[PDB]
Amino acid sequence: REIITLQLGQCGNQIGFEFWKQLCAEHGISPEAIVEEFTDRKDVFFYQYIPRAVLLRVIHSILNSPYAKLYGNNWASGFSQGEKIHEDIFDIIDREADGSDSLEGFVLCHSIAGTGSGLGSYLLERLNDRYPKKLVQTYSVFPVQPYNSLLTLKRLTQNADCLVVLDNTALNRIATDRLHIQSFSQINQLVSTIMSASTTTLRYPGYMNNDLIGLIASLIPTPRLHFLMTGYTPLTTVLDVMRRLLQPKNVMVSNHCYIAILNIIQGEVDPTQVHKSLQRIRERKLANFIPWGPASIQVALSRKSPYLRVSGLMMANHTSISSLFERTCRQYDKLRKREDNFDEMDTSREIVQQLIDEYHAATRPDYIS
Ligand SMILES: Nc1nc2c(ncn2[C@@H]2O[C@H](COP(=O)(O)OP(=O)(O)O)[C@@H](O)[C@H]2O)c(=O)[nH]1
């Protein structure tokens, strides 16, 4: 099973290039796409070595980078231009798809803030049209801006079978707090770190989580609640890691309870103390769960890249994320009363209102019906 990734817009292209840099460094692959001498399953993201990427001005910057051997501002303009070159890009996508043995998904890295937003909208629609059996995960990055953002949310709440949010505000906050920057090229480091650590269990095989469905179907219980948040504590026992992870100081997010939690530990820790960690976490009652269905926290281990200490990442399904949408929603209303049919934006507002209502109803003991 092979995962193909797509990079749209300046932000998406930059974060994808840095992610590929990080991943090539994790393995023994020189910038010249030649394996270095110096166990790690690398077939998923690399083709025998060339990455499975589809880039769509900064391309010249990448071509001038040492890694050359490795390959307007409106939403409506982006959508129109994406409709204009449907066949041109889809020939590339189809040749790269059918060239693969068994395709699995379509990772999409883009910022919902110019042309990237509408282009990703169009691509998501067309991929939902053509390929009906391919999971679509999206590493979308959150910031006339409210218009584009809400349109992207409208297209993402029904097409993408999963989604991971990344807000530049929280990243900048963490940068000023514990990195003391005052830049794109600095927050992108942490972004690429989180991304590389996200797909750790796919490249280093373990007891469980050998496929994307193993990561998705565990967290997302219903097809609507498919927005996740990330946490990365190392910026030592597993209990300390789990206690530092659940702190709101580290989560990349600007009653309420949890739906599903997943922990990935990349250290050489003793794997016998994890059950004690979970026992004590349940004892002290540091986190709450849904009252209707039985929801638990899952933990998995892995191995750090030997060619490159204890780290850890956390993927959560928290109902608080809806708050962010509200802000956008709010701004849209503020933008709707200040200034062919202009009805698509109204439908977008309607469906995002539906989604926020569903999130707000999810935290009730009678969420069913
Ligand atoms: N987190 C992050 N966001 C970025 C970076 N570069 C650009 N962005 C976002 O991308 C948006 C600009 O997109 P733009 O390049 O104009 O899209 P285009 O019109 O299709 O080229 C801004 O609102 C930024 O928030 C980056 O390095 N990191």
Technique that determined the structure: cryo-EM
Q: Atom of ligand 1 at shortest distance to CA of 116? A: 20
Resolution (A): 3.8
347 C-alpha to center of ligand 1: Å?
Answer: 26
Distance CA 244, CA 311 (A): 11
CATH 3.40.50.1440 location in the chain: 1-228
Nearest to 26 by CA among 210, 212, 193: 193
Nearest to 216 by CA among 204, 205, 207, 225: 225
- Residue 278: C-alpha distances to residues 105, 258, 284, 309, 332 (Å): 32, 16, 10, 22, 43
The reply to whether ligand 1 has any atom less than 6 angstroms from the CB of 146 is no
The reply to whether ligand 1 has any atom less than 6 angstroms from the CB of 116 is yes
Q: Tell me which DSSP letter residue 366 carries.
A: T
- Residue 329: C-alpha distances to residues 11, 20, 138, 229, 326 (Å): 23, 34, 21, 20, 5
Q: Tell me which DSSP letter residue 176 carries.
A: I
In 22-102, the DSSP E strands lie at: 46-47, 50-51, 53-55
Nearest to 143 by CA among 164, 115, 171: 171
The reply to whether ligand 1 has any atom less than 6 angstroms from the CB of 170 is no
What architecture (CATH level 2) is domain 1-228?
A: 3-Layer(aba) Sandwich (3.40)
- Residue 79: C-alpha distances to residues 120, 125, 152, 304 (Å): 8, 11, 11, 41
Distance CA 44, CA 200 (A): 12
CATH 1.10.287.600 location in the chain: 319-366
Distance CA 221, CA 144 (A): 34
Please state whether beta strands 2-7 and 53-55 pair in parallel, antiparallel, or not at all (unpaired).
Answer: parallel
Please state whether beta strands 2-7 and 103-109 pair in parallel, antiparallel, or not at all (unpaired).
Answer: parallel
261 C-alpha to center of ligand 1: Å?
Answer: 30
3-state secondary structure of 232: strand
Distance CA 96, CA 5 (A): 11
Tokens representing residue 88 in the block:
């041109």
The reply to whether ligand 1 has any atom less than 6 angstroms from the CB of 8 is no
3-state secondary structure of 111: strand
Distance CA 240, CA 273 (A): 11
**Domain 319-366 belongs in CATH node 3.40.190.10:** no
CATH 3.30.1330.20 location in the chain: 229-318
Token pair 């960690």 is found at 277
What architecture (CATH level 2) is domain 229-318?
A: 2-Layer Sandwich (3.30)
- CA dihedral sign of residues 16, 17, 18, 24: positive
